[PDB]
């Protein structure tokens, strides 16, 4: 299946005193493998997965050097943006950045990305063709003109199609024991009487990986959304994910309902029906 590598960066200004809070995390698919927190004592890029600990000293020194350079750019950006939007220096603001690459099922470059946000809203993003920019407003337009003249897209395209893909493949191999393994959801159903004539059926999907999944309820072979509830997919905390979907039904009619589970770790979708 396809795979991806992504880096997330968040910088929060602190007008009261000192420098912005900077936090960066790296991910391969749904597995975090590195992080950097300006508030931490190491002041170094740190491992968050066993398979990346294999990397030698030159790796960590290079990554640390580069991530620090990123925080400084963000620090500068927070100031530049404050001016563009003509904002006070007393309020705290946020700059976020995300970039990375995807490899298709053929393990070749599929797509790349590089987007930026200010105070939780799109600011500027590299288009899919990795040659043009999408600017949300006139502040972002000035940035766009500057990056076009400096040919920033060309430099990024080189990384996204080359370096990015090359390292993603390296990580996929080094951590193949987990990164290239799918964990099928473990499923079961619970029953809870809410009244003398009504009962709730909850369909559970546990300890699965990756996070992508679909849970659907059917009544007599027909999809049902009325009287149902599905919670957002949530992390179990051990690297896997969880989710459930519930439906309220007439006591005694539980057998008409079936829960359908689709996940790439499943050869065919699962179908559950209450006892």
């Amino acid at each position: 299946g396809s795979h991806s590598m992504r880096y997330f960066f968040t910088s929060v200004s602190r007008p009261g005193r000192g420098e912005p809070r900077f936090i960066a995390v790296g991910y391969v698919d749904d597995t975090q493998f590195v992080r950097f927190d300006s508030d931490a004592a190491s002041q170094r890029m740190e491992p968050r997965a066993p398979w990346i600990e294999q990397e030698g000293p030159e790796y960590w020194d290079g990554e640390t050097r580069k991530v620090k350079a990123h925080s400084q750019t963000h620090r500068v950006d927070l100031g530049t943006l404050r001016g563009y939007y003509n904002q006070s220096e007393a309020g705290s603001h946020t700059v976020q950045r995300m970039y990375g690459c995807d490899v298709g099922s053929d393990w070749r470059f599929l797509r790349g990305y590089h987007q930026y946000a200010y105070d939780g809203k799109d600011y500027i993003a590299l288009k899919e063709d990795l040659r043009s920019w999408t600017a949300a407003d006139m502040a972002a337009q000035t940035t766009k003109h500057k990056w076009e003249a400096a040919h920033v897209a060309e430099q990024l395209r080189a990384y996204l199609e080359g370096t990015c893909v090359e390292w993603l493949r390296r990580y996929l191999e080094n951590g193949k024991e987990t990164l290239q393994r799918t964990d099928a959801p473990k499923t079961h159903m619970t029953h809870h009487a809410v009244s003398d004539h009504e009962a709730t059926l909850r369909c559970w999907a546990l300890s699965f990986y990756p996070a992508e999944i679909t849970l659907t309820w059917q009544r007599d072979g027909e999809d049902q959304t009325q009287d149902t509830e599905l919670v957002e997919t949530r992390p179990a905390g051990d690297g896997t994910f969880q989710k459930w979907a519930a439906v309220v039904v007439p006591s005694g009619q539980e057998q008409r309902y079936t829960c359908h589970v689709q996940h790439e770790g499943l050869p065919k979708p699962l179908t559950l029906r209450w006892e």
């Binding site: 936090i23 991910y27 975090q32 927190d37 946020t94 939780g120 809203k121 459930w244």
Partner: protein, 99 residues
């Protein structure tokens, strides 16, 4: 802009009295990132609580997982207390074994 946090309180493994587990409070869809999250035991804050590294979704809203190792009982009550700029007062979501 600002966005209010969605909250989910749940255990990593099926709740079983007397058996060690992990209590989770997953907060997502919020902005800005500054947030206060405490796990409570019978109303009191738990000290040994950790959280994942700050990350965010496609729409830029943030998410964080706060967790602590715990042992559920029939009496003890657990909940997650969340405070954010978008909230007039601290929000509290009690832990339900069936959710």
């Amino acid at each position: 802009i600002q966005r209010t946090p969605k909250i989910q309180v749940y255990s990593r493994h099926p709740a079983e009295n007397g058996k060690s587990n992990f209590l989770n409070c997953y907060v997502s869809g919020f902005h800005p990132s500054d947030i206060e999250v405490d796990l409570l035991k019978n109303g009191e804050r738990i000290e040994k609580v950790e959280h994942s590294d700050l990350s965010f979704s496609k729409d830029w809203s943030f998410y964080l997982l706060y967790y602590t190792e715990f042992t559920p009982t029939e009496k003890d009550e657990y909940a997650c207390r969340v405070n954010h700029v978008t909230l007039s007062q601290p929000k509290i979501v009690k832990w339900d074994r069936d959710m």
